[PDB]
Amino acid sequence: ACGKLTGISDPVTVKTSGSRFGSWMTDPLAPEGDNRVWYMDGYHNNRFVREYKSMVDFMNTDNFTSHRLPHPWSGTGQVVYNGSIYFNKFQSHIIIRFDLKTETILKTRSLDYAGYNNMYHYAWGGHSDIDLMVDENGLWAVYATNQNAGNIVISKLDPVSLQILQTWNTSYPKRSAGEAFIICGTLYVTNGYSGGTKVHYAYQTNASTYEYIDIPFQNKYSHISMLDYNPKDRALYAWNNGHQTLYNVTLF
Ligand SMILES: *[C@@H]1O[C@H](CO)[C@@H](O)[C@H](O)[C@H]1NC(C)=O
Ligand SMILES: *[C@@H]1O[C@H](CO)[C@@H](O)[C@H](O)[C@H]1NC(C)=O
Ligand SMILES: *[C@@H]1O[C@H](CO)[C@@H](O)[C@H](O)[C@H]1NC(C)=O
Ligand SMILES: *[C@@H]1O[C@H](CO)[C@@H](O)[C@H](O)[C@H]1NC(C)=O
Ligand SMILES: [Ca+2]
Ligand code: NA
C-alpha cells in the first residue's frame, strides 16, 4: 500500500503541553493495543523522556514516567523504534540507541561526516542538524555534510549496529528545509517552519531523483519544530508551538 504522497489532512490537536519546541512519538513496532507516547520537551539541556502509558493517558492526564537518558539530546529529531530511542547526543554527531525498558545503552556510533551544533539545522534552528526517522523500510538519518555543500544527505541505518547501509546526496540545502519526513522511501521536505507551510520537495531514494511539488498542510499554531511520519498509523506527528498534533496523509 506504498505510494506517492498526494494530500495531508487537517491536523488534530492531541495535547497542549510543553515549551515551544519539542518532539513526541509512538513506536511503530509496538504491538496491537500498545500506544505508549514518548515525549521530549526542548531541544537542548534536557535528558528526561516522558513515557505516557497510552494515547488516552497522554490526552487526558498529566501522569507519566520519567526516563533519564545517559546524555542529553540535541534537537527534536529523535525516533522510537522497537523499544529503543535513537537520538543525537548533545554537541556531537553521535547517535545513541537506548533500550527504554531496560535503561541500557545498546549502541553508540558517530554518523560519518554529519554536521552538528546548528551547522545544518533545519530552518527553525534548535540544534536540529540530525533527524532520525522510521518508515515502512526501517531506520533512516537525514542530515547534511560539508562534502555535500550543506545539502541534505539521507542514509539508511542498521538499527542494531548504527552503521550506514546506503547514502543518497540530495541537492536541497538542509538549512532551507523547515523539516522533513520519509514515507515509503521518499524524502519529503517542507518549505519553512512558520506561516503557510507546504511540502515542496521530494527525493525518491528508489531512483535517486527529485522534484518540486506543492502539498499544503495547516500550520495550526504558528511554528513547527518537529514533523515525522509513523508507518504504523500512517500519520505525521508534529510539535507545533507547544501543541502536539497529528495529521493523516493520503498516498496514491
Ligand atoms: C499514574 O501512573 C502510575 C504508573 O502507571 C500509577 O501507579 C498511578 O496509579 C497513576 N495515577 C493515577 C491517578 O491513575
Ligand atoms: C524487534 O526486537 C525483537 C527482540 O526484542 C526482535 O526479535 C525483532 O526481530 C525486532 N524487530 C525488527 C523489525 O527488527
Ligand atoms: C555523496 O557525496 C560525497 C561528497 O561528494 C561523496 O564522497 C559520496 O560518494 C557520495 N555518495 C553517494 C552515494 O553518491
Ligand atoms: C485518521 O483517519 C481515521 C479514519 O480513517 C480516524 O479514525 C483518525 O482519527 C484520523 N486521524 C487524524 C489525526 O485525523
Ligand atoms: Ca522529521
Ligand atoms: Na526524527
Side-chain angles (χ1 to χ4, degrees):
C2 258
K4 171 185 183 170
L5 181 70
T6 59
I8 299 166
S9 299
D10 294 331
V12 175
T13 302
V14 177
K15 196 182 180 66
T16 297
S17 72
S19 80
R20 185 169 170 98
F21 318 109
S23 66
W24 77 290
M25 57 206 64
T26 60
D27 187 341
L29 286 184
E32 194 56 27
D34 178 356
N35 40 72
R36 285 170 164 101
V37 171
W38 306 93
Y39 171 111
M40 284 137 287
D41 198 3
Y43 68 81
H44 73 109
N45 283 353
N46 189 8
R47 69 174 69 236
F48 295 93
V49 180
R50 309 186 189 176
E51 180 198 352
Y52 295 80
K53 160 179 185 169
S54 69
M55 186 79 70
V56 170
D57 257 29
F58 182 60
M59 294 180 57
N60 297 284
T61 80
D62 298 305
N63 194 8
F64 55 89
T65 299
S66 281
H67 297 261
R68 186 178 192 286
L69 299 172
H71 300 289
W73 63 84
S74 281
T76 62
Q78 317 89 342
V79 67
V80 175
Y81 180 71
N82 210 21
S84 288
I85 185 173
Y86 296 79
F87 68 98
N88 180 205
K89 182 189 181 184
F90 73 105
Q91 308 224 352
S92 82
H93 63 195
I94 294 163
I95 295 166
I96 295 179
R97 178 189 174 196
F98 185 76
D99 185 83
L100 289 156
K101 304 288 181 63
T102 65
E103 303 180 359
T104 299
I105 298 176
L106 294 178
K107 199 75 196 175
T108 70
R109 193 183 295 274
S110 292
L111 184 61
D112 295 12
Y113 305 113
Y116 60 98
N117 229 358
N118 237 48
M119 288 175 61
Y120 303 130
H121 45 286
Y122 292 131
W124 76 270
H127 288 262
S128 64
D129 303 70
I130 297 166
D131 190 4
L132 306 174
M133 62 198 65
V134 167
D135 79 339
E136 289 82 0
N137 300 291
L139 179 68
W140 308 78
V142 171
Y143 58 107
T145 68
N146 182 77
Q147 32 274 95
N148 203 39
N151 294 328
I152 292 171
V153 180
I154 303 159
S155 293
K156 190 75 188 315
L157 301 181
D158 185 305
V160 178
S161 67
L162 300 176
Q163 298 270 25
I164 294 167
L165 300 175
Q166 184 169 355
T167 294
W168 295 257
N169 288 310
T170 85
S171 60
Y172 188 97
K174 190 167 174 301
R175 287 171 74 153
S176 295
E179 248 283 358
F181 57 86
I182 292 170
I183 302 175
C184 296
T186 298
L187 182 74
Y188 293 102
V189 173
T190 73
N191 67 334
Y193 61 89
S194 64
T197 41
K198 63 175 178 300
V199 173
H200 79 143
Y201 176 98
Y203 184 98
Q204 297 87 24
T205 63
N206 62 11
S208 301
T209 57
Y210 62 87
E211 52 177 345
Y212 288 87
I213 57 175
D214 197 320
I215 301 173
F217 64 97
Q218 179 188 8
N219 199 338
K220 194 171 186 181
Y221 300 108
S222 87
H223 184 289
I224 294 172
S225 53
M226 179 254 162
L227 186 67
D228 265 347
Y229 172 79
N230 186 309
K232 177 179 170 180
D233 54 3
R234 296 201 133 189
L236 306 176
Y237 285 65
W239 191 287
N240 192 187
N241 201 46
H243 309 258
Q244 294 77 50
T245 61
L246 190 66
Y247 305 75
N248 276 342
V249 301
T250 299
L251 305 189
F252 177 66

